[model samples]
Target chain A: VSKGEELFTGVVPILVELDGDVNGHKFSVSGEGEGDATYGKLTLKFICTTGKLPVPWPTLVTTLVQCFSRYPDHMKQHDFFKSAMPEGYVQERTIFFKDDGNYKTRAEVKFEGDTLVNRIELKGIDFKEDGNILGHKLEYNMNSHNVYIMADKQKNGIKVNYKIRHNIEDGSVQLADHYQQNTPIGDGPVLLPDNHYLSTQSALSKDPNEKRDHMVLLEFVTAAGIT
Target chain B: VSKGEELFTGVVPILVELDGDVNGHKFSVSGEGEGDATYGKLTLKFICTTGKLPVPWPTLVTTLVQCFSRYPDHMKQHDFFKSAMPEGYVQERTIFFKDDGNYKTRAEVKFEGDTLVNRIELKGIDFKEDGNILGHKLEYNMNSHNVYIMADKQKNGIKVNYKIRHNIEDGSVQLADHYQQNTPIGDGPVLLPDNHYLSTQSALSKDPNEKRDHMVLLEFVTAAGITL
Candidate 1:
């Protein structure tokens, strides 16, 4: 029966593709009733396009640049970008140490003029301490052509996926873990407050058994525009 | 001899006129010796240039204006300047208390801006509950242009004069009081570091006479383009 379930699970991706954009991005079950297993394990994957993007992509880039410019000097000490870039495009990452001896980090990168000088990434996250990670990742693509950025995490060998698409004229598109079923996304490495993209600190357990999973995933995609 | 002495006393004005600047800006002479059987007496009058004319006048005027501006708000709350003119002119006359029941009187007239704001004479200032008038006269003066401001206090009706000058460009000037001469000048009001300023409240007497002739003279002089 486990063999049958694995075979059925393999077909789930095909079923999701068949459904197209209907049902607000639903997740399809490849097989049911593998009956009761001791582990009660559930593995799921989602494929769906984020809905229509809003605000022109370039504007979003500029907005982020402006936001990063306001970062205080103490925050800049972290030197998240690892380079001396324009003031507006670089942001410092905030680090948190969890009670369970893990860390959560966050940062944002913005654009400077027409150059994609900022690429902020915050990693080394451990959730057992606070159940969250406290920073953000912002990437500005200045190739003047469309480019895609993705964040993918493996949790217990299972993939949790999140992606954002940036269109030069149409702004950005955000996708959650289970994109097809429109599952309410849990707090990502970067948390948003009231849709304002405010970062938050969180923790995750350090159990060895739980180490195989990618607890968080985030990615960004941009359309080609400038070099 | 008495007539000659009187004649000499009366010629003081002429002496000052001849000297042009008495004791510099002003000067006076008092008699310490008795005439016949009379007790020694002191008399004084002051005459000054009202500050240098034309070129020096603005500096004098500005100094006076700036000096009062430094008077703390607490002093202004006493209505001390309500009678003063914005144009900043002042004149005051005071006399020492001679009798136990009477007070040393003072009359002051001030012009501020376009208004003759204050015009009142204080009487009986020396009437103390303890029945002691240490003897002092407070005098203040300002010229028509208000280019210069000067104040003097004669303690015990003696020549322990205290004067302050406000120079337009320079800051305020304080005369040679012990504190002014001994201490460094800074941005704080003159305060007794040892709480001496509150001696009255503590019932502490640094001098046995209670009529301690300790006097303080404050002067603020302003250099060109300076304000305090």
Candidate 2:
């Protein structure tokens, strides 16, 4: 028997090219893995340099629907989603949390894999919905990067830009956003505490009500093993 | 939603290198898969490019056992026998062969994934123990490739590997070695036919009386998207 061991352990850094039409910012995604006599495992991590502010609640909801509608079409062209959802599946219901004064809107989408045939759930947060809530709930497809809002009637109201983070290893979602403004604002990358708000503000224009100027920064981190 | 469509509609070929030690001759194993809209309903067709012959029965059994033993260690890496056997699995015996002359041995092995756990069956064929045929009721791991023979004082015979073709797509095992061997072996880049009779002969020559030489060669084929 030939026993050959190959270990791949390091951070795979991915440089994001910011789209000027959207948020003009760059970030890094890294991953590591190793193979041995037993088996192999890997971990991935990602971070955004800037923070995104809030978009109007109604516009964000509409954008989310558009994103989800494009999923099935985009998925046909890529192997990523095929392998992700090995079993063919259909979406059930779209869940969301409205942006009442105290909380932002949070969204969750449910779907199934047809091959391996497993049920999967995707969640997003820190979005602008109606009322005084601080968060939003909506549906999202990881393979297609599709986002869907729960309802069409509650589509219009506020403006907000929210950053979403997903922990693949632990299956968790995190969001950060600024919902203080009432007018429609331009989008920009949201910065974290380590970098100060300079990088985030610099990426955005001074106008407080620029509807198209808003941007979002999403981060992801995975564990090292079969956690 | 984007409708389901066949992305890659072509056959993928795989080559199985034949080592001279198993049988006496050096032969090659190849297979292919063809179908449309593989997303939901897919069919994998496999052909043994080489002719089939009688295999050493004991060696076949051992090979299956080794295959299963190494299965979890190499692929799934979990103890399936202890954790995943269904409640009635032990009582209800799953028969592999349809006739008295033909026999099969099977076992189940399980593994755990991130969220769900699964079981894979490992099995062997053409086995008999004692005066009564024991091959039909052999109990073993599904993840193993070998079958276990219950030692019977009344039964004392060697194992046999007749010409056979296993349909992985439908989980059906058929005896087609007679036709497979008589056909003129073709030679093509994607489709070729060869036999491992020489390989078996060589192994038999090394140990005429040895129990390990009892092994046979079945044809191996490959399909486009079939994982195993």
Candidate 3:
């Protein structure tokens, strides 16, 4: 699914519409989440809407989780979205790893505006607060995500001179920003999460060849809009 | 000294008038921060409108810092403003701790709005992302500083039932719609930054003093205004 002009500001539904095959069991999935983002949680849902429990809801969730675990970043679109997007990819999962919590300190540079420094030696600023330095200036680059800070009082002292970078996709730290081999973006349109469901069928089909025939992978091409 | 209706929306000056004593050196500071707050970095200076270096400026800043370290919250108005204000307290530093590089967990409890949980059993609605529970609701309190949240796809999988409180005054967590806090209120009056300088002297004089006999305390009572 793609974004509208006011995307994410309102409800953005993820249509399940799955009628596919797992390794051996037959499968069908459907549903949608309420808001764009939860009250604040970054989640969207698509369950069995029209009929009974398409399958043990947990069974579907469990299977999808395993598929994502085995796939690579670029492979998500080519593999999971292959059948799902019989047409073309509207949006793909830009995810390579499981999301932990929220975007936390990626690199080491995300300090706030009210930090303080204590005066020890003849450090930076001449203005001493109980001997520590007062942070007076902050220079940052959203692009580089680097932080260079200055303290008040001294002509010198307390200069930030390190460059610790955070990997955009995985919660890994490095020396620079690279959209190279395994780098993905921060969040996605629901590709990584939805792929879980898609992968579930594929995964279930993997072990039991007969079960694969019974399972069906139904794909929802259009990402339903809220209003 | 006092916030106007617009307050820092315009240029708000922090008057500098020190009519006191440090060690044996007499003290007097005057001048006002021109802007309200810096957009980011915080700096407020008061150059002499006329007089010579009444006292080495560093002496005054050092002494002021020390005085505040010893003084109590109540003493800010009573002592620092003794020469600064003949009236009552307009605003004062409610601070009592040294500032760190960034705000540490202020009294705890403050987390992101979209915090999450994992499922072992089952609860809520049905949504799966990264295998973890997607947060859906946020319950919070401003006065006590609490955040109780809920997630999706759970009948009893993950429920956040704890309170992480943050110190509001010290760039800590906010209530409902803050910088969403646990963060400074934006630079200060200086785009939120400039306000920091104004609040600095006020913060510096918040207490702990030896009644600096030689050190002088200049109180710039008339908070300057920006050139409207």
Best of the candidates, lDDT = 3
The best candidate by TM-score is: 3
Task: Label model 1 with its docking quality class.
Answer: incorrect
True contacts kept of each: 0.00, 0.00, 0.00
Q: Candidate 1: TM-score?
A: 0.14
* Candidate 2, lDDT over the whole model: 0.20
- Looking at model 3, give its docking quality level: incorrect
Residues A1-227, model 2: lDDT tens digits: 10000011122222211111112122222111111111111111112223342322222321121011111222222111112121222222222332322232222211222101112222234433432222223112121011211111132112233342211212233332323211101122111111101001000011112333332212111101111
* Residue-wise C-alpha lDDT for candidate 3, range B1-228, written one tens digit per residue: 322112222333333343433223232444333332211111234443334433333222311211111112222232221121111112211111122111111111111122111101101122222211122111111111111222212221112232222223223432212111221112222111111101112111101122222212222112211232
Q: Candidate 1 regions off by >4 Å?
A: A1-227, B1-20, B24-76, B83-109, B112-228
RMSD of each: 35.5, 25.1, 27.9
lDDT of 3 at B64: 22
Per-candidate chain B TM: 0.18, 0.19, 0.24
lDDT of 3 by residue, A1-227 (tens): 32211233333333223443322233344433322221111122333333443222322221221111112333333222212221222221111112211111111111022111111110111222221112111111111111222221232112222232322312232232111111122233223322111111110010122222132221111111111
Q: Number of backbone collisions per candidate, in order?
A: 72, 88, 98
Q: What TM-score does each of the candidates earn?
A: 0.14, 0.17, 0.18
Candidate 3 chain B has its poorest 10 consecutive residues by lDDT at B115-124
Candidate 3 TM-score, true structure as reference: 0.18
